[PDB]
Amino acid sequence: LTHPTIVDGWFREISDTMWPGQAMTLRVEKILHHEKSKYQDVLVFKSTDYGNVLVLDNAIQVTERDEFSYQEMIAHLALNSHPNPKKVLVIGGGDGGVLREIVKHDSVQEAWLCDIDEAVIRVSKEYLPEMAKSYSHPKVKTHIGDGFQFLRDYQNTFDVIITDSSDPEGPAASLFQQSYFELLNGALTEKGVISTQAESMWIHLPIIKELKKACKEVFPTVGYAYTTIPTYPTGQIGFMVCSKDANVDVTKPLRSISEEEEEAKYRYYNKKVHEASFVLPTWVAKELD
Amino acid sequence: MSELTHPTIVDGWFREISDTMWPGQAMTLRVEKILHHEKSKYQDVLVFKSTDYGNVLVLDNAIQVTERDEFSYQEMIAHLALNSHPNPKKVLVIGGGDGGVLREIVKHDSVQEAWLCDIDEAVIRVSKEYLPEMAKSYSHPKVKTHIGDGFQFLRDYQNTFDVIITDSSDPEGASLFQQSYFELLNGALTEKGVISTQAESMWIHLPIIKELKKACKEVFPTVGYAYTTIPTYPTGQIGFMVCSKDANVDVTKPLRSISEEEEEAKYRYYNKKVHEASFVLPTWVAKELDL
Secondary structure, eight states: OOOTTEETTEEEEOOTTTSTTEEEEEEEEEEEEEEEOSSSEEEEEEESSSOEEEEETTEEEEETTTHHHHHHHHHHHHHTTSSSOOEEEEESOTTSHHHHHHTTSTTOSEEEEEESOHHHHHHHHHHOHHHHGGGGSTTEEEEESOHHHHHHHTTTOEEEEEEOSOOOOSHHHHHHHHHHHHHHHHHEEEEEEEEEEOOOTTTOHHHHHHHHHHHHHHOSEEEEEEEEOTTSGGGEEEEEEEESOTTOOTTSOSSOOOHHHHHHHOSSOOHHHHHHTTOOOHHHHHHHO | OOSOOOTTEETTEEEEOOTTTSTTEEEEEEEEEEEEEEEOSSOEEEEEEESSSOEEEEETTEEEEETTTHHHHHHHHHHHHHTTSSSOOEEEEESOTTSHHHHHHTTOTTOOEEEEEESOHHHHHHHHHHOHHHHGGGGSTTEEEEESOHHHHHHHSTTOEEEEEEOOSSSOOOOOOSHHHHHHHHHHEEEEEEEEEEOOOTTTOHHHHHHHHHHHHHHOSEEEEEEEEOTTSGGGEEEEEEEESOTTOOTTSOSSOOOHHHHHHHOSSOOHHHHHHTTOOOHHHHHHHHO
């Protein structure tokens, strides 16, 4: 097989808008799958050093080697900021990774996925088995469809909502951030928590500042956290973590487990990392104050 | 060929490649113009203007600094060490040819002398021309430079330095970070002396970090591993060993600090909270480094 992103045995992800003037490249052992779904270009290749790689519309989504950092941080930052999460939703979690993290929490009764593209779920089951094993968990429920319409049908339903979806970055996304957070707010229960993929503070601090402002218009409790991902450009990405409960501090874990069971359950997240992930470099902290 | 050319730059992009040290991945930077290329007695020296990260210094095909993001490394390697000493007056940097670490060192009032020892005059000369916001430190009155190999320098200055920072063009790397290198540093330090050394990224070289930590613990009673994020380095980060000869200091929490207002005036990455956070490691790393 061939793919435009793969030349002379190396995958390259480039974006003049997302990451101006820098790229990430990964050595390709073999292309495993390429299809055009009803929604997007779907590429899977086996990399030589990071396991299988899922690429959607030419942007890396996960590699098997380092996916756990993102999945764990976006999920457990939010779940451990709710006193007793019973119904949880991930929007855009087709690869199964966030669902895998959700069902680690015993209190959870239902782990919902809302994703638009069945093709992503199908290829993740075949090529990302350590992520998509979550689909065999009894608590997992999958809705195929538009996330925005699901949220209207399920007002005051979810204790935690996780948006596992690239932060749109144009002037259109900028103006509609607040509208999207208000949509999430309506689907949350009274102390509901959200975590949303944001941006890397090294390259898009102005977008993060905008996201923080939009979040504060909707939620009384707003924080920005980040995690490191060696295959993502700049090497990290951030998350907005917000709660409808004015009384919670999302920057210190409301709930935690013993260090022994953290070591059995998590490879990146723990109660100390939870706090450290909101500790930002001086120039970022000052700009977001 | 009237235009400058370099094997690391293909079709207008610099590629950060090493089949040995980060196999199968390469960060790349778009090049505006190649500015300088020479071969010194010791290494290949390349400078280019990137389109989005300013000027870039590359040594033996490995990126060293870009003007846009160099402050993360320089601040963290310097201030993690300096703020772990109660009153550092004489400081040494080994291999800090770009001048960035010196620039951070001289921000501390207590420092009276900031020595640099580098083998390669070429790096200093090129840095003064192409990295002005780093090499401005060379004109600071506290700064003294010695051109030469750091072993003979350290052997000649025992019980002399309160802090020694090792900033080589690669984390060794010429991986002379055996226990004997740390013993040599131990002797050049004063009785509560502190070292910081470039280590490895925990995403790709955790077994080397564990070995480095064991070797440091053979020499120093107080040893910690911290990291910082660098958007143009492989994996986007690198770690540091921070050690003290004083068993009664905790390097993982800042012994000394300045007010938050002064921090915002002087530092762009480091601060007293980041100091503590930089030793908080992801679970798989922390578990392995406590083993």
